[PDB]
Structure 1
Amino acid sequence: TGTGVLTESNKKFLPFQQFGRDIADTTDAVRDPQTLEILDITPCSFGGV
């Protein structure tokens, strides 16, 4: 579960591997469950006012 921007990914995925991850425990990538594509989860543009 999450909220974000699903963008195309240029990173190769090992066929064994299921979903991406970053060093700070963050799901910074996810293989598309329906078909074998890698989608980067870009954080939403929130900054501050």
Structure 2
Amino acid sequence: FGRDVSDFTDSVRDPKTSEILDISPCSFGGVSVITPGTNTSSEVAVLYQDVNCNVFQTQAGCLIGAEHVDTSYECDIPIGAGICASYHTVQKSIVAYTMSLGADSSIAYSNNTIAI
């Protein structure tokens, strides 16, 4: 048999046909559930942390059950890595988007003028 830094069998020699086999856990990864609220709707969006995979890939993982939106609102449901989800009228559905940092503005720089 074999053992790890934590006591657990990872390598076992096959009785018949000696050949060394690796044993790994079946379950691996992470999953989160995004819901607009039971009172509003019963639909949910599931986000799997460690997968490549209406699917839509984020930096946190592959998020399913929601639709991609190319315009940026403020954040109400803070999904990781800058993505946010909300209930919008697209009937309604869960939509994912990148959070808006702020309002764009530019000020002209001049060496002779001031504002009072």
Which TM-score applies when normalising by structure 2? 0.24
Larger Rg: 1 or 2? 2
TM-score (norm 1): 0.49
